[PDB]
Every structure is written in structure tokens, then in C-alpha cells.
């Protein structure tokens, strides 16, 4: 029953709520479909006759890229640690767009050994991500909006993307 | 005719440049006008205000009196100098004697009535002359004589017809939109020496025409910022409207409901209506439980 209609607002002057229509089918402000982590669940929603939106209610893995060589595998999720526009969204652990979520990127390491053949100090990458392949808790954002895609996509953070975000972590 | 037309154009702009410079006096005077309205109003409230900071208030009141009397003498002096140079005052000998005389407050009072009366006779001559000048030039005298007499009054006549009603326009200037309360205003009304605050007679906020004047400022300053820059287009004018009303006296959290609202929500009065003594103990042994805690 949420409204997305434009006539509900006040004018640039601030006109006093002229009350022309009530709600119709066309301005159907849908519910906020906040997700969480867990076993994958899909809702199919029919809008505009033939457009099938995909509501992601629970999701467990994602396709996250690493831009320095341009590759992306399937990684199991761990948990969100920061979101820019909200803070209780993190405590809820609901994955929206641009949320900074932990993963255990073991097949990223397995690809790294299958492409280079050298252990990670237990052609090169900068030192601040060597702090947590030993921890095995790699940070990644969310690229796609999961509420209509029915998919979880992101990229691993790269260079200054850490150096601005652990600054915002602490 | 080219040199005679546009020599007046130098006279227009120099009068318009001098027009803008006097509004700079009108800009810089408002902090005195605002703080004067928060002064104590009665004779007795001045004395109680002089008790708290008695030595500090006495030098500043003498400093206020010296700076006001200095500013009052020179402004009469400039008004005498302006009316002589713009041939408003026909008596140069009387006006030149007033410039060299050290005047008290009452003599500056009486000379104000002298310069305003000479301006009044100059005004009714000018306003009747120029309203006749535009009506003959526009050609509407031969087309609008018999139908719209109530609207086509002369500009001098349109002035004095609004000067029939001093009463309503004096109800305008008591409108306290600023919510300014003078010192010991609450004590003086309670003592009978003097509540809808929206009309307050002892409060003198002439902001209504001054906001019109500041609207007249931004209309004339835009037209006079053509070449490089004028005196003050919007600096300390719209801000002067703001800080007297505390820029907007609004809170963003109270807007969104992100701040708590201490107002009655009119549907939710009495559905979950209260009960009897719902404490199954007699509440004084729980006071012992609250004094001597079973965790403390």
C-alpha cells in the first residue's frame, strides 16, 4: 500500500495537497524486499503484463569480480560489515547494493595457485590484502540491486577502495 | 540634442549611484534597529537593567549616546546639504546657518520637522508635475477619461488617498513576525505598565516595509549591478531576514519525526484505556525492593 505517486508531495511553493486521485494500479509502490543470508529463495513477480521481476529473499553466494586481472568465480558469503547509507542494515545483515560483505574466497586462492603456483607469503598485488588471505575473510561490495535481479553480484575492493573504507570502518 | 539628452543620463546614474549608497546606510543600521526593540520599555525596567552590570552599562550608554548624537547631527547636515544642492530648500541662508551650529537633541528634533515639511511641499509639486507628464505622453487621456476615474488618479492623489487611512497601515507595523520580546516585557505587562504576540505596539518591527524595501533593494541592486558590482545585492539583507527569525527556527529531526513530538496524536487517545491498580503487590514493599535491590 506504499505510494510512489508524484502528486502526494508539496509544490515548489508548497501547495496544500490538492487531493486529485486516490491510488490506482499504475503507481503501485511495492514493498521493500529486504533480504538476508541463508538458503536461496526466489519470488517471481509479474508487473506490466510480461516483465518478470526476481525478488531475492535469501541468498548464499555471489559472482564477485577482481578487477586487476578481470576474473570472477563463485564465492560463499560470510556477512556484511559496512553499508554507506545505513548502519542497522549491517546489524540486520541484509544485502542491498554497495554493501561491504565478507567472503571466504578459497577458489580465488585456488585459482591463484593454479595460475601462479606460489604461496601467499605464509604480477603482484599490493600488501593490504595479504593481511587477510591468512584470515580468509575477504571484503567485497555489491554491484547489482538484488531486489529485482534475483542475483548477487559485486567486485573485490581494489587499492584505494580499502584505504577509504577501513578508514570508514574505524 | 544628443549631448543634452545624455548629459541627463549622467545625472540619472549619479542619482542612482547615490540612491544605492544611502541604502548602505539602511543596510548597516538594522542591527541598531533590532537591538533597540529588545531594550527595556518602561522607566522602571531601565533601572533594574542598570543594577546587574552597573559600571559596564554606564560607559556603554554614554558611548551609545555619543555615537547616536554624532550620527544624528551629520545626517541632518547631509539632509540640509542634499536639499540645498538639489534645490529643494529655497532658503539657503537659514539652511547654511544650521550646518555651523552645534545642536542638541531637541534642536535636531525640530529641524527634522523643518526638513520634512520642506520635502513635503517639494513632493506635492513634483508628484503632480510628473503624473501629468506621463499621462500626456502616454496618450491615454483621450481614451480613458470616462470609464476608469477611480484607477487613473494622479500619483500625488494616489499617495494621499492611502494617507486617508493611517489606522490600518499602523496596524501593519506592529506585526511581530520576528517573535522579538523586549527585556522585562513579561514583568511590565504583569505589573500593568503596558497573549497574542503577533500584534505588539511597544515592539517596533518595521520589517514589513523593510522587507519590501529589501525587495526594493534587490530590484534596484540587480538593475545597478550591470557594469561590475553594486554595494550589496543580497549580502546581509536576506541574512538579516534570517537571523532575526533564527534562520528558520526549524529542526530536521522534528520534520521527519526523527525527533520526539510532544503533541497529542488525535486518534490514539483511548483504545488501550487504563486499568485499575495493576500492581499485584502493594507497591511500598517494591519501594524497599527499589531502594534495597535484590541485585544490588
Amino acid at each position: 500500500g506504499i505510494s510512489r505517486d508524484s502528486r502526494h508531495k508539496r509544490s515548489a511553493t508548497g501547495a496544500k495537497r490538492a487531493q486529485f486521485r486516490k491510488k490506482r494500479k499504475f503507481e503501485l509502490g511495492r514493498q521493500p524486499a529486504n533480504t538476508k543470508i541463508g538458503a536461496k529463495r526466489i519470488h517471481s513477480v509479474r508487473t506490466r503484463g510480461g516483465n518478470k521481476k526476481y525478488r531475492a529473499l535469501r541468498i548464499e553466494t555471489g559472482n564477485f569480480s577482481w578487477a586487476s586481472e578481470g576474473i570472477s568465480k563463485k564465492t560463499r558469503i560470510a556477512g556484511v560489515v559496512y553499508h554507506p547509507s545505513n548502519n542497522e542494515l549491517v546489524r540486520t545483515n541484509t544485502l542491498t547494493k554497495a554493501a561491504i560483505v565478507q567472503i571466504d574466497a578459497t577458489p580465488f586462492r585456488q585459482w591463484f595457485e593454479a595460475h601462479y603456483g606460489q604461496t601467499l607469503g605464509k604480477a603482484k598485488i599490493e600488501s593490504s590484502v595479504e593481511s587477510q588471505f591468512s584470515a580468509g575473510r575477504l571484503y567485497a561490495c555489491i554491484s547489482s540491486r538484488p531486489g529485482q535481479s534475483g542475483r548477487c553480484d559485486g567486485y573485490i575492493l581494489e587499492g584505494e577502495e580499502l584505504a577509504f573504507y577501513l578508514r570508514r570502518l574505524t | 540634442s544628443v549631448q543634452r539628452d545624455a548629459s541627463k543620463g549622467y545625472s540619472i546614474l549619479q542619482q542612482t549611484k547615490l540612491f544605492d549608497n544611502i541604502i548602505d546606510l539602511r543596510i548597516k543600521l538594522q542591527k541598531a534597529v533590532i537591538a533597540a526593540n529588545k531594550l527595556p520599555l518602561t522607566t522602571e525596567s531601565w533601572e533594574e537593567a542598570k543594577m546587574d552590570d552597573s559600571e559596564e552599562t554606564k560607559r556603554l550608554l554614554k558611548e551609545n549616546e555619543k555615537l547616536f548624537n554624532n550620527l544624528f547631527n551629520r545626517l541632518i547636515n547631509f539632509r540640509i546639504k542634499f536639499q540645498l544642492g538639489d534645490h529643494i530648500t529655497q532658503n539657503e541662508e537659514v539652511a547654511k546657518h544650521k550646518l555651523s551650529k552645534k545642536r542638541s537633541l531637541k534642536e535636531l528634533y525640530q529641524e527634522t520637522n523643518s526638513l520634512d515639511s520642506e520635502l513635503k511641499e517639494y513632493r506635492t509639486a513634483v508628484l503632480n508635475k510628473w503624473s501629468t507628464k506621463v499621462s500626456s505622453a502616454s496618450g491615454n487621456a483621450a481614451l480613458s477619461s470616462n470609464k476608469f476615474k477611480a484607477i487613473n488618479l494622479p500619483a500625488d492623489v494616489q499617495v494621499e488617498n492611502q494617507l486617508s487611512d493611517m489606522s490600518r497601515l499602523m496596524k501593519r507595523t506592529k506585526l511581530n513576525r520576528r517573535n522579538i520580546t523586549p527585556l522585562y516585557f513579561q514583568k511590565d505587562c504583569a505589573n500593568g505598565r503596558l497573549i497574542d504576540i503577533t500584534e505588539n505596539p511597544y515592539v517596533f518591527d518595521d520589517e514589513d516595509f523593510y522587507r519590501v524595501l529589501l525587495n526594493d533593494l534587490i530590484d534596484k541592486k540587480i538593475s545597478n549591478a550591470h557594469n561590475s558590482e553594486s554595494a550589496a545585492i543580497t549580502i546581509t539583507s536576506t541574512n538579516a531576514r534570517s537571523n532575526n527569525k533564527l534562520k528558520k527556527n526549524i529542526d530536521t529531526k522534528a520534520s521527519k519525526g526523527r525527533k520526539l513530538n510532544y503533541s497529542v496524536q488525535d486518534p490514539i487517545a483511548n483504545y488501550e484505556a487504563p486499568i485499575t491498580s495493576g500492581y499485584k503487590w502493594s507497591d511500598d514493599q517494591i519501594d524497599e525492593f527499589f531502594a534495597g535491590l535484590l541485585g544490588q
Binding site: - | 556603554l60 551629520r74 544642492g85
Partner: protein, 51 residues
């Protein structure tokens, strides 16, 4: 710091604010009423031979 003290200095800061600007304004008006025209308007003397 009493409230009356803050009001009197607020008037005092505004009184000298109008005190210096009318010196500039009467300085402009004296230069526009006497024939000692400054260098910014020397062209008015050159344009009009009947000054």
C-alpha cells in the same frame, strides 16, 4: 555578560557602521556638487565644453 550589554554593543557596532559609510556618501556628494571632479569622471569635462 548581561543581555543589555550585548544589545548596547550591537547598537554600537551598527552606529559606527553607519558612521563611516555616510562619510563615503557625503564624500561622493561633495565631489558631485563641487567642480573638483575626480579622475574617474574626467571624460564628462572633455565631453561638455559648457561645464
Amino acid at each position: 555578560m548581561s543581555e543589555l550589554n550585548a544589545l548596547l554593543k550591537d547598537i554600537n557596532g551598527s552606529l559606527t557602521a553607519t558612521s563611516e559609510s555616510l562619510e563615503r556618501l557625503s564624500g561622493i556628494y561633495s565631489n558631485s556638487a563641487t567642480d573638483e571632479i575626480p579622475e574617474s569622471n574626467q571624460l564628462h569635462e572633455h565631453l561638455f565644453y559648457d561645464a
